[PDB]
Write a protein that binds this DNA or RNA. Structure first.
Ligand SMILES: [Zn+2]
Lengths: 51, 105, 135, 204, 106
RNA sequence: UUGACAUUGUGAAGAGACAUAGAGGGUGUAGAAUAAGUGGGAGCUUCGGCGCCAGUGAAAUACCACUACCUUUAUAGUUUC
RNA sequence: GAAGACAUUGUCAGGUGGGGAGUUUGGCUGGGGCGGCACAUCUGUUAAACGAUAACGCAGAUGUCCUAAGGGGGGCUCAUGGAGAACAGAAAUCUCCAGUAGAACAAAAGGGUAAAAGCCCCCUUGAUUUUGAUUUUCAGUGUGAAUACAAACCAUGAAAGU
RNA sequence: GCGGAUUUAGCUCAGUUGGGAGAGCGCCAGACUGAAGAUCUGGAGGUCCUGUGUUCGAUCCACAGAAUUCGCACCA
RNA sequence: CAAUUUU
């Protein structure tokens, strides 16, 4: 028959995400010499709503 | 049906050419073959894609299949062919059809 | 092998050529290592190749190539014949021995349907040819 | 050729310490099975004996009973009837007359075990009365089929040399090489054992 | 299906001609049949061997062959738009001499 | 999805089978025995064991080149998971 | 940093696979399906006295059975019914007497058969071998079936012959 | 068509080296109490798949065959 | 530990 509804999600047609609000890589520190043999402490500046 | 043994028929040969005395067996047609000729013209053609060239056979109607008797001889160990009629229970041993006196009641 | 392209693998024909995953590319895989080396440098004439190494993914080859313009080859008449303009892109018309045997060219009692190319012997044997006096 | 030089007739006459002679049992492995199709009959030819001491224990209606002193010595005619339950067991291989196709239920019935009258499970009787009956030193020791393995072909005594033993094991092994065909397992060619009762030998 | 056998519609064609249910009467087997004379076919129900088909009933022809206990006749038969010679082997019980053409002789 | 082969190298542990010096299981009545084996039948044995003799059992006995799957099993040898 | 000769990659081999691909989905017929098979055959009848002759006309049948229920030879006569015998009876067995088939012959219905082609006893394996001709459907193509033969060898009979 | 599996008391279950017929329920009897109703013992159990053959000794083995079977294989 | 009726 025709292609099926859960097979048209596999090509980025209109089924992609919505991206101009999602405002950052939500990923933590790239491991370094400091995070293995001591510490390096930082402050927070603000918290924001995600998208 | 009942068929008795030893069936002294007209042998042919080239040693006697008259009635010398045989013994009877039926047979089986054996394995089909590998490395024959007509089979080599089947697995040359069914190779590859496509598949199933030559017709298979589904619609069957025969009950029995015309049982046949090998008449194998004694004097020179030749044999011969014979074909009586078709038979859906072919009793080959002894079991002499006697005068049935009582009929099992 | 090669995989005929056929979107999602449905060749839309009769089943005699229906499959896709073991069709095997009737010209030689040493000969495919020149069109993707001739296009890298189109200004040089492919002489010949030879096998060198073979892992499980990459049949390595070399290809000997000659500058047809470097005038030590235009002079010095032992190899000036490749400067001739019939031999331009000498591979894809099937001329090196990589491709000679892919075309299958020798003579004998074996190679009836190919000894000048398998399209001439096709063409000369089934063109009806009629004389003006009807023989 | 598997017995040509030795191990039957040359290095057997070096270890003997019995003054009396020796009667050679045989060891060999012929595989046939419970499939009662290919039994081990057709006892072979008989050219030469193997030191008979047994004295045969039957009665005779033979045409040769007028002159039954040539090579045998047992002359009692058939009309002994009621003298066989327990008295004589000096009888393992015997002869018989052709009359005993008729009466032989009578001297069987309770003496079933120790083989003191013949029956259906070991019939001898022979009508060939010149070769087997005129050479009575021929002890007809059987190669009769038991359900696994009876290989009992003998050769000679401890006084018989090599030239006399050119014929003895070579054609009398006709049992295991005429019955043995496409049905047969092991030993289309053999794995022999050659010694009677006293000393060592070689199991190739 | 449609039944057209070999003895088809021969209910009354082969009966024993009532009040003559018996064996053959022996003035039948003594006269001889040399080739070159007219004979005709009247069927014989008591015997079975050598019997012709029901069409050759009352039809007549000449004898071309004599055998151990049978003779052979030729018969013209309409089939479409030609006639055929037909060859048929009848045992001697079916066949008599007809009195048509020895009037022509006498 | 599951096998084999190749890419694919360098060292050890053991397991089961093929494989071999081989060890050794057994229902009455009688034999002698209270019995699975295979046979010629007489002696070899410091013994006189049965003497092959009858003694009686399912085929003898003592005895052997070993005739039972020669399993119950430790061992050198193949391949081996 | 992990993972390390296993995954991965390539070739071959089974399994899974309407996710796809290609293709069919009988014929007769008082419309078509459905019911039946009248599609291959056989008996009688419809059939108008050579033959041929139709309907989803009529009443039925077959896709098997048989070493004897084949072959031969020899002895006997059946269905019934009447007269009589102890248990014996509507139904047992034994005589006598009438008895053209009114009985039996593998299987549908016709035809046929009486010192038999039926019912019993004896002897066997012609239910063999080589190849041709002929008949009915028939275009006078073929399959199937049958018929008279020729040459061999057998069986049976005492023999003619089968 | 190949390769393996089953066939019993009447229904339902099962052991037998190959030197014995294995348990319950329908039916019938008896007992135990004051009568029932459960409970107890005994009686009525067999072409024992149908055979054939084997070894000293077949309800059980070897080979063959009829009802059911599960996988596998399909060129008239 | 089995156990329930009895005009
Ligand atoms: Zn012959």
């Amino acid at each position: 028959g025709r292609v099926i509804r859960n097979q048209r999600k596999g090509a980025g047609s209109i089924f992609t995400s919505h991206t101009r609000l999602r405002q950052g890589a939500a990923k933590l520190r790239t491991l370094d010499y400091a995070e293995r043999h001591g510490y390096i402490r930082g402050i927070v500046k603000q918290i924001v709503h995600d998208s | 049906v009942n068929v008795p043994k030893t069936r002294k028929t007209y042998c042919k040969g080239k040693t006697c050419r008259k009635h010398t005395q045989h013994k009877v067996t039926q047979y089986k047609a054996g394995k089909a073959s590998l490395f024959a000729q007509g089979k080599r013209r089947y697995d040359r053609k069914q190779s590859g894609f496509g598949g199933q060239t030559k017709p298979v056979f589904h619609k069957k109607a025969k009950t029995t299949k015309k049982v046949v008797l090998r008449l194998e001889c004694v004097k020179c160990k030749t044999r011969a062919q014979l074909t009586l009629k078709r038979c859906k229970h072919f009793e080959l041993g002894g079991e002499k059809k006697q005068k049935g006196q009582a009929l099992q009641f | 092998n090669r995989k005929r392209p056929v979107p999602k693998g449905a060749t839309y024909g009769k089943p005699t050529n229906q499959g896709v995953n073991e069709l095997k590319y009737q010209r030689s895989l040493r000969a495919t290592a020149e069109e993707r080396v001739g296009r890298r440098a189109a200004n040089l004439r492919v002489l010949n190749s030879y096998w060198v190494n073979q892992d499980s993914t990459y049949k390595y080859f070399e290809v000997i190539l000659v500058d047809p313009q470097h005038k030590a080859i235009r002079r010095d008449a032992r190899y000036n014949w490749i400067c001739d303009p019939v031999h331009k892109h000498r591979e894809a018309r099937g001329l090196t021995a990589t491709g000679k045997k892919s075309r299958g060219i020798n003579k004998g009692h074996k190679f009836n349907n190919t000894k000048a190319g398998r399209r001439k012997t096709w063409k000369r044997q089934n063109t009806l040819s009629l004389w003006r006096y009807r023989k | 050729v598997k017995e040509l030089l030795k191990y039957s007739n040359e290095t057997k006459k070096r270890n003997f310490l019995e003054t009396v002679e020796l009667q050679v049992g045989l060891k060999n492995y012929d595989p046939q099975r419970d499939k009662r199709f290919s039994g081990s009959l057709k006892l072979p030819n008989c050219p030469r004996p193997n030191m008979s001491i047994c004295i045969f224990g039957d009665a005779f209606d033979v045409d040769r009973a007028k002159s039954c002193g040539v090579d045998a010595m047992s002359v009692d005619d058939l009309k002994k009837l009621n003298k066989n339950k327990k008295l004589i067991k000096k009888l393992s291989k015997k002869y018989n007359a052709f009359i005993a196709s008729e009466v032989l239920i009578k001297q069987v019935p309770r003496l079933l075990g120790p083989q003191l009258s013949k029956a259906g499970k070991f019939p001898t009787p022979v009508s060939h009365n010149d070769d087997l009956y005129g050479k009575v030193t021929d002890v007809r020791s059987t190669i009769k089929f038991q359900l696994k393995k009876v290989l009992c072909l003998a050769v000679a005594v401890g006084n018989v040399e090599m030239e006399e033993d050119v014929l003895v094991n070579q054609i009398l092994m006709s049992v295991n090489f005429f019955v043995s065909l496409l049905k047969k397992n092991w030993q289309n060619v053999g794995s022999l054992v050659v010694k009677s009762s006293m000393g060592p030998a070689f199991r190739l | 299906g449609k039944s057209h056998g070999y003895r088809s519609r021969t209910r009354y064609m082969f009966q024993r001609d009532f009040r003559k249910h018996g064996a053959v009467h022996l003035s039948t087997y003594l006269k001889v049949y040399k080739v070159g004379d007219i004979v005709d076919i009247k069927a014989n129900g008591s015997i079975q061997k050598g019997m012709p088909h029901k069409f050759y009933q009352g039809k007549t022809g000449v004898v071309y062959n004599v055998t151990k206990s049978s003779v052979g006749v030729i018969i013209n038969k309409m089939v479409g738009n030609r006639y055929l010679e037909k060859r048929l082997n009848l045992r001697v019980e079916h066949i008599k001499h007809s009195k048509c053409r020895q009037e022509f002789l006498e």
